[PDB]
Amino acid sequence: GNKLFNIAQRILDTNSVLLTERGDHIVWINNSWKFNSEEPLITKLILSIRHQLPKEYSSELLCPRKRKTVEANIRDMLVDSVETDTYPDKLPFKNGVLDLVDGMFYSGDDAKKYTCTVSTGFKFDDTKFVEDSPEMEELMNIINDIQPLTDENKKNRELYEKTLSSCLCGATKGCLTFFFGETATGKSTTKRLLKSAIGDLFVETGQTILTDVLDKGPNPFIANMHLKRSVFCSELPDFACSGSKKIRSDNIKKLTEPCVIGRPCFSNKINNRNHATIIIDTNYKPVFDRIDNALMRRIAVVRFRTHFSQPSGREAAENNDAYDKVKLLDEGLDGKIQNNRYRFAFLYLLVKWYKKYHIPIMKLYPTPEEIPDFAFYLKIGTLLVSSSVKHIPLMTDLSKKGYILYDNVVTLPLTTFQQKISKYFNSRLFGHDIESFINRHKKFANVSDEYLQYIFIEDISSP
């Protein structure tokens, strides 16, 4: 009995509705997996696949009440969760899945085995996914204008290519990249090109994810990054002028983890999967509230140094020290990019870069030598080291150099340490930094009298 129960069982036997570990209901319609808590996806699937059931079952599914009964039966039948979005080298489209390691495009049940629950939102066109075209030469000219193929720009260009290509691989990336440069240098053009290329896998959020508390309450600004392969933030302010909050290192470290806590309004799903490449456009370098060794492992910088100016302001730009090259501005390029002219050309370029930079494992490495905020830590980290045991047979040398021994621990006088620091970094130049380092790296032998359990590398080098 229960024709409706039989219909629900038949639909469940097709493996077209699945329950995820988070609590979602993903359905397979029109050659793609979709989930949406606001749309009647299960009844949509029932109506869509009414054609694959017997003729006596097809006519029963034209009634919304009966479709809702079938949906209730299916919901009670789904008891086990599944693992979704586990292939980091598959790019999902609206009509199939592209193999990023092989170049094969799968449609239908071939693409169904990879439970890719997101998509670009548009259809793959193999007649445009071609190497040579009128659009490809123009796109290559644009890219070579933005990032010149010169010898002094080799490393920066390769880093730019790697960062752009990493927006295809759906895994957790462990760095935050900063597109730094002066005005009119191509950063927004690059952003728009990437958005056109990867479609719905691209999202843009606010600086609140960098300068606010992520726990909070309902946070759609974080909940909108679930499974996105690229996240953009833009327009960092100048932190030198007091009045702007600094970037939270806690947020920076929390954004590189495989899961991020944040939930929408009227929703109970708090944890989102992190597959994102986070890129920040800025005219100014970042300043963080607190600097430590971990934070320095998650920051990378790509610099833009080509100006596109109108003919009136070309001469003033040619004498600027923030530009290496000046080019003529193009006034139709924005519209051409907006109309998705270079979508498949840039997609092909990104796939080629993915192949080139995906030597067995692809990983993003930090560039801490570019951020001025990290210079004080980087310099002093190679000059002073903790107490020494194998250098214990040098206590006479330490005493002659000014150090003292206390429980076989090297201690330096505060005044002597200040005088030594003044040589490498002037007091007038970095008094706040030197005083903070003295107060932070030193232990308190008393309320007033204290000592630093850190000796200079050069002092120990002296025999």
Ligand X SMILES: Nc1ncnc2c1ncn2[C@@H]1O[C@H](COP(=O)(O)OP(=O)(O)OP(=O)(O)O)[C@@H](O)[C@H]1O
Q: Which residues bind ligand X (CB under 6 A)?
A: 142, 145-146, 181, 183-189, 281, 308, 327, 329-330, 333-334
DSSP notation for 42-57: HHHHHHHGGGGS-HHH
Site map (CB under 7 A) of DNA, residues 252-281, x = contact: -------------xxx--------------
Determine if 321 is a binding residue for a copy of itself (CB under 8 A).
Answer: yes
DSSP notation for 244-273: SPPBPHHHHHHTTSSEEE-B-TT----EEE
CB of 23 to DNA, least distance (A): 14
Determine if 217 is a binding residue for DNA (CB under 7 A).
Answer: yes
CA dist list (Å): 220 to 223, 278, 304, 305, 421: 5, 17, 31, 35, 48
Q: Which one among 40, 218, 237, 402 touches DNA, defined by CB under 7 A? A: 218
Determine if 38 is a binding residue for DNA (CB under 7 A).
Answer: no
**Residue 96: left (phi > 0), alpha (psi -120 to 50), or beta?**
left
Assigned token pair, 301: 């910088």
Query: CA 430 to CA 433: how far, in whole Å?
Result: 5
Could you tell which of DNA, ligand X, a copy of itself, none binds residue 308, using a CB distance below 5 to 8 A set by kind? ligand X
Could you tell which of ligand X, a copy of itself, DNA, none binds residue 281, using a CB distance below 5 to 8 A set by kind? ligand X
Query: CA 11 to CA 6: how far, in whole Å?
Result: 9
Give 223 or 247: the residue with its C-beta nearer to DNA.
223
Site map (CB under 8 A) of a copy of itself, residues 220-249, x = contact: x-------------xx-xx-xxx-------
- Alpha carbon of residue 77 to chain centroid: 38
CB of 291 to a copy of itself, least distance (A): 11
Contacting DNA within 225-254 (CB under 7 A): none
Query: What dihedral angle (degrees, nearest 10) is formed by the CA atoms of 350, 356, 360, 363?
Result: -60
Query: CA 164 to CA 167: how far, in whole Å?
Result: 6
Give 254 or 327: the residue with its C-beta nearer to ligand X.
327
Site map (CB under 8 A) of a copy of itself, residues 28-47, x = contact: -xx-------xxx--xx-xx
Question: What residues make contact with DNA under the rule CB under 7 A?
Answer: 217-218, 265-267
